[PDB]
Amino acid sequence: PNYCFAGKTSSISDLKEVPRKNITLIRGLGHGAFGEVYEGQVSPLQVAVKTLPEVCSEQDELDFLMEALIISKFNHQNIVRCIGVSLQSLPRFILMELMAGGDLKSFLRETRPRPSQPSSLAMLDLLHVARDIACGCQYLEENHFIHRDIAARNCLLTCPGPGRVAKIGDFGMARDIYRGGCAMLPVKWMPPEAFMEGIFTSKTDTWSFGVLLWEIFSLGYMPYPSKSNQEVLEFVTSGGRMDPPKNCPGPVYRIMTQCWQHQPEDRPNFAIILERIEYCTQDPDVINTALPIEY
Numbered sequence: 028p029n030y031c032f033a034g035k036t037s038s039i040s041d042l043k044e045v046p047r048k049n050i051t052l053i054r055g056l057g058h059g060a061f062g063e064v065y066e067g068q069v070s071p072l073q074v075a076v077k078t079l080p081e082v083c084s085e086q087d088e089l090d091f092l093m094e095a096l097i098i099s100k101f102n103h104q105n106i107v108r109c110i111g112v113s114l115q116s117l118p119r120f121i122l123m124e125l126m127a128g129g130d131l132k133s134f135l136r137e138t139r140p141r142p143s144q145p146s147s148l149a150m151l152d153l154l155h156v157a158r159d160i161a162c163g164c165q166y167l168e169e170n171h172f173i174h175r176d177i178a179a180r181n182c183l184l185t186c187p188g189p190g191r192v193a194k195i196g197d198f199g200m201a202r203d204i205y206r207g208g209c210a211m212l213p214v215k216w217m218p219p220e221a222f223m224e225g226i227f228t229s230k231t232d233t234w235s236f237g238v239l240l241w242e243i244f245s246l247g248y249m250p251y252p253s254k255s256n257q258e259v260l261e262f263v264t265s266g267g268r269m270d271p272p273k274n275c276p277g278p279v280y281r282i283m284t285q286c287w288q289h290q291p292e293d294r295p296n297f298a299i300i301l302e303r304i305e306y307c308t309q310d311p312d313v314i315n316t317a318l319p320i321e322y
């Protein structure tokens with residue numbers, strides 16, 4: 028099973044196999060549905076370890092290999108690094124850059140300003156996270172890779188504090204498509220032509236990014252509050268769009284509404300999105316806006 032990305036093809040033989048003896052598991056990280064994930068170390072190098080359960084289908088095996096190949100071929104500061112794999116021992120491992128800040132949705136929810144920590148986050152921290160991820164999306168778009176599942180839950184942070192860098196950290200949806208059901212589709216992150224016609228383009232990710240933006244500036248709320256998948260599908264196809272997150276500056280909301288343009292051709296590409304986010308970081312009225320302090 029081969030993988031093509033950019034102007035090169037790669038094989039399982041291209042994966043950097045790490046000697047199993049050199050790998051130590053330290054703690055579980057909230058192992059997702061399929062496959063457990065651990066914090067671990069390579070004889071010291073800090074890693075996240077994605078495991079393939081030994082009880083799996085041949086198809087599971089292939090998806091796992093594909094995931095390894097996809098992540099290993101990326102080379103960008105806002106895409107989580109692959110340190111290597113261990114496929115020659117069971118259970119099989121994929122080794123990733125450990126992102127000590129955890130996932131973005133948890134970070135936002137746990138770092139919301141409160142009367143005890145009213146200074147935890149500012150508008151500028153949110154814009155930098157947005158910029159980081161948009162930079163990762165731009166690298167994907169210019170390499171003609173469509174992510175298909177841009178969302179806070181799939182983004183990671185290097186550290187909780189001020190120097191944090193956000194990176195795209197999961198590629199499970201793109202993987203499944205390279206190789207399912209309605210109730211598993213990330214409907215709330217998808218533009219009309221995607222869930223209607225099954226058409227995906229770099230403009231598919233633009234729409235999702237807009238939704239990611241709302242997640243970020245809402246500080247980790249679920250998109251379309253109180254609506255189910257189908258209700259959202261009908262809301263959005265009828266021209267319905269989310270309101271601004273609480274206290275959200277107008278210039279930021281305008282980026283969202285441009286990302287959610289009904290026609291893909293009317294939506295910005297990530298180069299434009301980046302420029303608009305940068306202009307936002309420069310506007311004192313944007314970055315001097317206070318975030319809501321939840322009680």
Ligand SMILES: Cc1nc([C@](C)(O)CO)sc1-c1cnc(N)c(O[C@H](C)c2cc(F)ccc2N2NC=CN2)c1
Nearest residue numbers: 056057059064075123124125126129130133181196197
């Ligand atoms: C240290 C650390 N803490 C995390 C918490 C528990 O979710 C809190 O933010 S994720 C995390 C953490 C740190 N670095 C990683 N390289 C990582 O990768 C896993 C495969 C991952 C990548 C994603 F893009 C999204 C979710 C997950 N998870 N998270 C749990 C299972 N898969 C997780």
